[PDB]
Amino acid sequence: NSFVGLRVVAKWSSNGYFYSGKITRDVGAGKYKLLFDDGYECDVLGKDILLCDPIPLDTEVTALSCDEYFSAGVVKGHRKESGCLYYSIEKEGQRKWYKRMAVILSLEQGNRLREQYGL
Amino acid sequence: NSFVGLRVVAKWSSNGYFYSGKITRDVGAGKYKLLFDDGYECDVLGKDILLCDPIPLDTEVTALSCDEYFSAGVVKGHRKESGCLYYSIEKEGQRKWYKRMAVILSLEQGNRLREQYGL
């Protein structure tokens, strides 16, 4: 049951989005240190951490982009190119590719995925 | 007079990068509430906030990319298309376009700009 170095989607704020990152260390009491893709390293409780290296397909997510700001869409495909992972988020009936860090889950979506994928 | 609604590059961690965002509110004691482009809204001290809506040209920055991870480069141009702003970061003698959220300043790089652009 090694959970070190596994990419996970976890929230680091009491009321915030579930941002993507990777587990850098497994501390006691189920509190894992996560280095997030944006460079912020901090400790997060297992409940707040979702063990989803590939974002599940056909899962509602929040896509962050300069255009449309914080849109809501559904994953409709994955594409790993030269290590870079992209998710095909369908917003308003239109599929667009978003980087791993450009896709984060809302509180409701994170809670929905916690039941199945939750540390 | 007011700094609210002005894009700024500020750090929200004691030892962290200067992430881009926008001032959502001006609170007392020079402590401004910033909504960052990643959706994290929190209060930041004026020292940690850099007033640079367009990232300064010919300024050393840290480009975050899936490939090359946290590379370092220098801005060599800007391009705003349909609101989306891209910076031409020159890494290893090669100019590559990065989104606004894809470019963040390091501790030393951000400090170097504090003397000029610092709240």
Author numbering:
A (entry chain A), B (entry chain B): 1484 to 1602
Copy the relevant paper text.
A low resolution (3.79 Å) model of 53BP1TT-CC derived from X-ray crystallography data was sufficient to demonstrate that both protomers were arranged similarly as wild-type 53BP1TT bound to our small molecules with a root-mean-square deviation for backbone atoms of 0.94 Å. We therefore created 53BP1TT variants that can be switched on and off in vitro for ligand binding. As we showed in vitro, 53BP1TT-PN and reduced-state 53BP1TT-CC cannot dimerize and are thus insensitive to UNC3474 and to the related, lower affinity compounds UNC2170 and UNC2991.
The DNA damage response protein 53BP1 (p53-binding protein 1) influences the cell cycle dependency of DNA double-strand break (DSB) repair pathway selection. The localization of 53BP1 to chromatin also requires that it binds histone H4 di-methylated at K20 (H4K20me2) via a tandem Tudor domain (53BP1TT), while BRCA1-BARD1 recruitment requires unmethylated H4K20 recognized by an Ankyrin repeat domain in BARD1.
